[PDB]
Amino acid sequence: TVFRQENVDDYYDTGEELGSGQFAVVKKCREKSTGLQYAAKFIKKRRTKSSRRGVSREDIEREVSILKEIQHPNVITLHEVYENKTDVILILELVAGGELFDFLAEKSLTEEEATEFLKQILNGVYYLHSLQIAHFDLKPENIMLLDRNVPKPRIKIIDFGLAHKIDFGNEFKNIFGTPEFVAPEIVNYEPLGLEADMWSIGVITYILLSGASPFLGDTKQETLANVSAVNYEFEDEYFSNTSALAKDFIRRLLVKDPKKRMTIQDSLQHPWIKP
Numbered sequence: 174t175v176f177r178q179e180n181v182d183d184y185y186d187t188g189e190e191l192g193s194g195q196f197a198v199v200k201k202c203r204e205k206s207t208g209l210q211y212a213a214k215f216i217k218k219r220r221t222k223s224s225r226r227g228v229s230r231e232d233i234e235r236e237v238s239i240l241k242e243i244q245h246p247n248v249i250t251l252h253e254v255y256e257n258k259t260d261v262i263l264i265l266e267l268v269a270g271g272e273l274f275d276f277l278a279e280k281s282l283t284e285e286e287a288t289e290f291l292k293q294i295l296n297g298v299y300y301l302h303s304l305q306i307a308h309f310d311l312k313p314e315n316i317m318l319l320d321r322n323v324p325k326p327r328i329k330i331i332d333f334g335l336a337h338k339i340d341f342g343n344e345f346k347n348i349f350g351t352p353e354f355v356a357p358e359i360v361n362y363e364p365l366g367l368e369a370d371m372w373s374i375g376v377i378t379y380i381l382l383s384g385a386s387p388f389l390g391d392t393k394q395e396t397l398a399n400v401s402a403v404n405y406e407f408e409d410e411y412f413s414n415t416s417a418l419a420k421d422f423i424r425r426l427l428v429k430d431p432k433k434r435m436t437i438q439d440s441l442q443h444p445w446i447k448p
């Protein structure tokens with residue numbers, strides 16, 4: 174599938190950089206014809222078939238195809254796609270209030286603050302899972318606020334670089350996500366489905382409530398070994414005023430067997446969340 178091959182600089186001006194990775198960089202931009210503002214994600218293309226640098230065209234096309242299907246308040250909306258010899262450029266909805274991760278470092282949250290964020294994450298994932306889309310990369314870096322200066326900030330899941338459609342219940346591909354947040358089946362290179370996102374939500378909830386990461390070791394191999402063994406606990410020093418029901422919600426998500434883990438529907442009906 175081919176994208177717009179006019180020079181993106183003829184239609185947009187770029188500004189502040191928003192984010193930066195191994196093969197992508199995201200810049201604030203403004204569309205010249207409308208004045209409207211977006212985030213331009215420049216993804217570096219692979220320059221040969223066998224190369225390890227850049228992103229394969231198959232991977233780029235998959236991310237674009239997923240972004241084209243989604244429209245929901247808690248997920249980013251794709252506006253346009255351009256390409257040239259070196260990059261694919263996704264013109265994405267601008268979400269300018271910063272990371273949940275950085276806003277977190279400003280203060281642990283109360284349970285109400287945490288559940289106000291978490292309910293929006295769950296609504297966005299419920300939409301994705303309803304469409305059989307696994308995100309495969311849920312972590313604080315990928316959740317950003319629309320305005321960080323209100324008591325109840327609104328959030329969006331802002332990247333879809335590892336997302337896959339799960340039309341057979343599972344996909345058998347390796348997901349090199351972030352060790353602290355990946356489920357045991359990712360660590361163990363097993364078939365993956367929507368359940369892996371529910372584990373990541375469990376990790377995110379533990380961090381929202383405590384400020385501490387449940388499986389983090391001193392090296393990436395220790396973190397991965399801890400994930401696979403489900404080696405975590407609720408430290409009293411961090412959880413002593415956290416309700417038992419909040420702990421129960423986490424415990425039912427940080428479950429090794431994906432079949433026994435809460436689903437997104439289960440998570441919305443759990444007594445900690447259900448109104």
Ligand SMILES: O=C(/C=C/c1ccc(O)cc1)c1ccc(O)cc1O
Pocket residue numbers: 191192193194195196197198199211212249265266267268269317331332334
């Ligand atoms: O930082 C990133 C995304 C940021 C962002 C900010 C605001 C938006 O509106 C949209 C995206 C980012 C995304 C993908 C990646 O591989 C590496 C990265 O560093």
